[PDB]
A = this chain, B = another copy of it.
Amino acid sequence: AKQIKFDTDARNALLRGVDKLADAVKVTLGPKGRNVIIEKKFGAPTITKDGVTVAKEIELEDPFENMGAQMVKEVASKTSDVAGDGTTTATVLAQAIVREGLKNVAAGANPMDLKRGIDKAVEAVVEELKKMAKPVNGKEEIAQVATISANNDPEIGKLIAEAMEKVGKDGVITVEESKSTETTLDVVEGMQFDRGYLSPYFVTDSEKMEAVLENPYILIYDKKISNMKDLLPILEKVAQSGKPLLIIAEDVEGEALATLVVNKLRGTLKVCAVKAPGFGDRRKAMLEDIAILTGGTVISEETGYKLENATLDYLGRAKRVTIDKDNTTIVDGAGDKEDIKARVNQIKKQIENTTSDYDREKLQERLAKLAGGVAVIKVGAATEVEMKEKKARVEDALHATRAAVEEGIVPGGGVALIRAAKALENLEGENGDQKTGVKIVRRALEEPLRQIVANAGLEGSVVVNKVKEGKGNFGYNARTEEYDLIEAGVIDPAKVTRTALQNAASIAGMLLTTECVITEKP
């Protein structure tokens, strides 16, 4: 059986679910935010002042409210930032826009024209957000934005600024737990390709949704993997080696996947599988390049090596690898460097050889991918737990600084969306309903400030009004209850605010244009 709700009843149930998730999450917004307690099975109370954590333990009894909750949760979480105020800002914006849109279109508006107006004004406000952002490019200012990112600790800001200078803007920087007491920085060779694991049952660091293998074995394979019968000796010699093996194959599926899941869950064998990087003839190209990186050899039928022919000598070796959901990192592939610079030489020989722009672009990407290198930081401090907290801080600073160099910075604390609303002053849609949608999103842009100061328990209207009278970077610093942000340095990357607003507009559009809902009866 399946329950079905149509039109206003369905939309109201979805609004109820989204409102419940909002009031669950919106309270933990800002510096002076509230705290939410969690009941966990066979454990103590745990409180959380971060909106990402409180979101994930939301699941409602009523199926309709539940789908609304999971809808806003998923579309809101597509933003890049995970440190904070990325999944909460989007959620409060989504609640605001959805509430006003549904509760106006109940008063006789056209939902589709409302969605059109919402999208138009979101385009206008993201354009203004791009215009407003101050770019960051240079050592002193990336150090400054890192320090603002790292809770005002100059040394981590200096370290990360230096690192992103060494490797390059588009380059890759990774952090890892160290054994020493000092903090230092090296840049090694390595690869990172945007193909993650094949199933989620390899995550070792469940706290961070990543799987890590130490001193692994890398099999460079080109063909498919379907059958259990053919990969026995590799697994046996890996178990006899007592080290992990990471599987890079064309397509692992079926009984092979079932068997490796079984032995991974049982813990007998530390194994992980990822999709093969590249595409086609260039899949073969980057596969043989990463083979010569890691020091192994390719296993492919064009050179007459069956899968079971692979041995210790043919396998590829490195030190550390991380398998996140999207990408995968290879750092310091244990291979002789002379052939690596020979690879780079033949790469530039290809540069001067080729003629077509598509070839030039893709192989310049390859050059940056191999010769660019991997920045590694040996974060270290006095005690273990403080070192864990320090590496967490380094990771958050890395993400924030990467976003800042990507698309500038904006005055944070909810005032960026205030100053971005100036572009909505003299914009009129094709009809009255689109102007209504423009007004709705204009009213919704200021809700982060309203709630960031409502969490502080002050009157919101006075502060938002006298923030609106200002211009430039004038705004409310919620931490100190002052009225400057230019250099006060409570800032957010423009990218996180832009994508939070875009996601909120998207989910509001998909939610205002729904008049049918389908759920199971328990």
Measuring CB to CB, which residues of chain A are less than 8 angstroms from any residue of chain B? 1-4, 6, 14, 20, 23-24, 27, 32, 34-39, 41, 44-45, 47, 54, 57-61, 63, 66-67, 70-71, 74, 100, 103-104, 106-108, 110-113, 179-181, 227, 242, 254-255, 267, 279-281, 382-384, 432, 439, 455-459, 461-462, 465, 510, 513-521
Decide if A279 touches B383 in the complex (CB within 8 Å): yes
Q: Which of B4, B14, B519 contacts A20 (CB 8 A)?
A: B4
A24-B518, A37-B518, A39-B63 known; 4 other A-B pairs, CB under 8 Å? Answer: A1-B61, A39-B519, A45-B71, A58-B518
Give chain B residues whose Cβ lies under 8 Å from the Cβ of A37: 14, 67, 71, 514, 516-518
Least CB separation from A268: chain B residue: B255
- Min Cβ gap A116→B in Å is 10
| Given A20-B4, A104-B108, A462-B462; A513-B35 close (CB under 8 Å) | yes
- Min Cβ gap A91→B in Å is 13
Decide if A106 touches B103 in the complex (CB within 8 Å): yes
Decide if A242 touches B267 in the complex (CB within 8 Å): no
Decide if A517 touches B36 in the complex (CB within 8 Å): yes
- Min Cβ gap A230→B in Å is 8
Chain multiplicity (copies) = 4
- Min Cβ gap A43→B in Å is 9
Give chain B residues whose Cβ lies under 8 Å from the Cβ of A54: 516, 518
Give chain B residues whose Cβ lies under 8 Å from the Cβ of A513: 34-35
Decide if A516 touches B36 in the complex (CB within 8 Å): yes
Decide if B39 touches A279 in the complex (CB within 8 Å): no
Could you pull out 10 A-B pairs where Cβ atoms are within 8 angstroms? A2-B57, A2-B60, A4-B58, A27-B516, A35-B513, A36-B518, A37-B67, A44-B70, A255-B267, A462-B462
Least CB separation from A20: chain B residue: B4
> Please, how many angstroms separate the alpha-carbon atoms of A491 and B518 in the complex?
31
Decide if B518 touches A74 in the complex (CB within 8 Å): no
Decide if B462 touches A34 in the complex (CB within 8 Å): no
| Given A107-B104, A255-B267; A47-B462 close (CB under 8 Å) | no
Decide if B2 touches A32 in the complex (CB within 8 Å): no
Decide if B227 touches A179 in the complex (CB within 8 Å): no
Least CB separation from A227: chain B residue: B242
Give chain B residues whose Cβ lies under 8 Å from the Cβ of A63: 39
Give chain B residues whose Cβ lies under 8 Å from the Cβ of A279: 181, 382-384
Q: Which of B14, B432, B461 contacts A461 (CB 8 A)?
A: B461
Give chain B residues whose Cβ lies under 8 Å from the Cβ of A520: 39, 41
Decide if A518 touches B34 in the complex (CB within 8 Å): no
Least CB separation from A179: chain B residue: B280
Give chain B residues whose Cβ lies under 8 Å from the Cβ of A382: 279
| Given A27-B516, A384-B279, A517-B37; A457-B44 close (CB under 8 Å) | no
Decide if A6 touches B23 in the complex (CB within 8 Å): yes
Give chain B residues whose Cβ lies under 8 Å from the Cβ of A58: 2, 4, 518
Least CB separation from A28: chain B residue: B516
- Min Cβ gap A458→B in Å is 8
| Given A59-B2, A518-B37; A74-B27 close (CB under 8 Å) | no
Among A32, A74, A255, A515: residue with most chain B CB under 10 A: A515
Give chain B residues whose Cβ lies under 8 Å from the Cβ of A227: 242
Among A57, A457, A510: residue with most chain B CB under 10 A: A457
Give chain B residues whose Cβ lies under 8 Å from the Cβ of A517: 36-37
Give chain B residues whose Cβ lies under 8 Å from the Cβ of A35: 510, 513-514
Among A20, A44, A58, A180: residue with most chain B CB under 10 A: A44
Least CB separation from A112: chain B residue: B457
- Min Cβ gap A19→B in Å is 10
- Min Cβ gap A92→B in Å is 14
Give chain B residues whose Cβ lies under 8 Å from the Cβ of A111: 34, 457
Decide if A112 touches B2 in the complex (CB within 8 Å): no
Give chain B residues whose Cβ lies under 8 Å from the Cβ of A71: 37, 45
Give chain B residues whose Cβ lies under 8 Å from the Cβ of A32: 112
Decide if B59 touches A1 in the complex (CB within 8 Å): yes
Decide if B461 touches A34 in the complex (CB within 8 Å): no
Decide if B280 touches A110 in the complex (CB within 8 Å): no
Give chain B residues whose Cβ lies under 8 Å from the Cβ of A255: 267
Decide if A36 touches B514 in the complex (CB within 8 Å): yes
Decide if A459 touches B461 in the complex (CB within 8 Å): yes
Decide if B24 touches A516 in the complex (CB within 8 Å): yes
Decide if A515 touches B34 in the complex (CB within 8 Å): yes
Q: Which of B27, B103, B112, B462 contacts A108 (CB 8 A)?
A: B103
- Min Cβ gap A10→B in Å is 9
| Given A227-B242, A462-B461, A518-B57; A67-B47 close (CB under 8 Å) | no
Decide if A107 touches B110 in the complex (CB within 8 Å): no
Decide if A515 touches B106 in the complex (CB within 8 Å): no
